């Protein structure tokens, strides 16, 4: 069902109800049906997954009836299908990470070039467009050019990338000086 | 069914500029990616880029920066691809294709357009 | 770009025996989270435009015969056909869909009577 996009470094919640709005027994796997954490009462046990030491739950909700997956310092690598098995029903929840730098540049001179390039999942395929300072709107792909960089480029970035029809956006300082 | 329909066979003169068209239906238009690829007569078949017709976000094939230029009409369900400066070389034909699905569960191209070939002549 | 090699360029090979076609890739397209190869197969008939054989390195698409078939891993990728039938005359290219997309340089089949 669910689309989820989240960003490189950051921290996603991605949800599981049951239609049962009491604790009941729950566990999370990715595709490759590694375990990634269920429990035991409301004893939580992780499982053999890369995802071991940045995945956790939220124990206060499970009452409510919220079982949340909780995955932190995300990696363009934890992209990936996740499934949620709650009261013998399937719950499934896709996630891809996003990221997107400048390059090795930051802190630039009048008339320079700016270039960011864009990090994600394999088979994506994303686009982004920022919009400078000064409000001019720029569009790119993989990559965003811009070729000659004016004292009101300095300041803060808002990119946002779109796969399909969901978007995550970043926030991208550049200093740009005479 | 899902169909891709493309525009006829043009000519055009070295150094002007052609604008092609690839048709979509039996499906949500917004819903999914459309990719270009070219083939020289004989040749291989050479990715161009792609465009997300939802919002007409757009990505080139290093080879294209600057050479292509992609948009879409949402209400005619069209996608547009137009080639500039164009020279003897640029002859081939041009499809258009879909991914299968989307958010990177099928990005291989399962359908494709029967091709425009554009030839590049005075 | 990744680059994707195809080799041969083209083939021969009698009614009935077996074809294998190689494409490597100049980097991994084996994704390790999940475990799949984002590799696909098209055949090109003379004629027409590119036809989807397999998806994912080695499941064969809705209607393709089963004397198709694919595998490799990483790197490295074949296209085989189990017992070469007349219809089977055309460019076979391969694909990867790993990091935006690029297909190999294609490998002719031509049949030999």
């Known amino acids: 069902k669910k689309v989820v996009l989240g960003k490189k470094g950051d921290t996603v919640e991605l949800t599981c109800t049951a239609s049962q709005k009491k604790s009941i027994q729950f566990h999370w796997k990715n595709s490759n049906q590694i375990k990634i954490l269920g429990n035991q009462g409301s004893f939580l046990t992780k499982g053999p997954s890369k995802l071991n030491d940045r995945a956790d739950s939220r124990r206060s909700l499970w009452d409510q009836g919220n079982f949340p997956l909780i995955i932190k310092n995300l990696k363009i690598e934890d992209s990936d299908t996740y499934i949620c098995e709650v009261e013998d029903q399937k719950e499934e929840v896709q996630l891809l990470v996003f990221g997107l730098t400048a390059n090795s540049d930051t802190h630039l001179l009048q008339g320079q070039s700016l270039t960011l390039t864009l990090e994600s999942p394999p088979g994506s395929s994303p686009s982004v467009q920022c919009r400078s300072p000064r409000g001019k709107n720029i569009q790119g792909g993989k990559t965003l050019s811009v070729s000659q960089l004016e004292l009101q480029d300095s300041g803060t970035w808002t990119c946002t990338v779109l796969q399909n029809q969901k978007k995550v956006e970043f926030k991208i300082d550049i200093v740009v000086l005479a | 069914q899902v169909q891709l329909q493309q525009s006829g066979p043009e000519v055009v003169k070295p150094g002007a500029s052609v604008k092609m068209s690839c048709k979509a239906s039996?499906?949500?238009?917004?819903?999914?990616?459309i990719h270009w690829v070219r083939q020289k007569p004989g040749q291989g078949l050479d990715w161009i880029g792609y465009?997300?017709?939802?919002?007409?976000?757009?990505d080139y094939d290093e080879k294209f920066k600057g050479k292509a230029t992609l948009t879409s009409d949402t209400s005619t369900s069209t996608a547009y691809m137009e080639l500039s400066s164009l020279r003897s070389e640029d002859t081939a034909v041009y499809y258009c294709?879909?991914?299968?699905?989307?958010?990177?569960?099928?990005?291989?191209?399962?359908?494709w357009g029967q091709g425009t070939l554009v030839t590049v002549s005075s | 770009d990744i680059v994707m090699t195809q080799s041969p360029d083209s083939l021969a090979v009698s009614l009935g025996e077996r074809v294998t076609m190689n494409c490597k890739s100049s980097?991994?397209?084996?994704?390790?989270?999940?475990?799949?190869?984002?590799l696909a197969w098209y055949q090109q008939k003379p004629g027409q435009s590119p036809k989807l054989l397999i998806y994912?390195?080695?499941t064969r698409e809705s209607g393709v015969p089963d004397r198709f078939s694919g595998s490799g891993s990483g790197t490295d990728f074949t296209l085989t056909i189990s017992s070469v039938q007349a219809e089977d005359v055309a460019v076979y290219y391969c694909?990867?869909?790993?990091?935006?997309?690029?297909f190999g340089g294609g490998t002719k089949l031509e049949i030999k009577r």
């Open positions: 294709a879909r991914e299968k699905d989307n958010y990177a569960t099928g990005a291989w191209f399962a359908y």
């Open positions: 994912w390195a080695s």
């Open positions: 980097q991994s397209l084996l994704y390790s989270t999940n475990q799949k190869n984002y």
């Open positions: 694909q990867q869909y790993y990091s935006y997309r690029t």
């Open positions: 465009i997300n017709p939802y919002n007409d976000g757009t």
């Open positions: 039996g499906y949500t238009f917004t819903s999914y990616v």
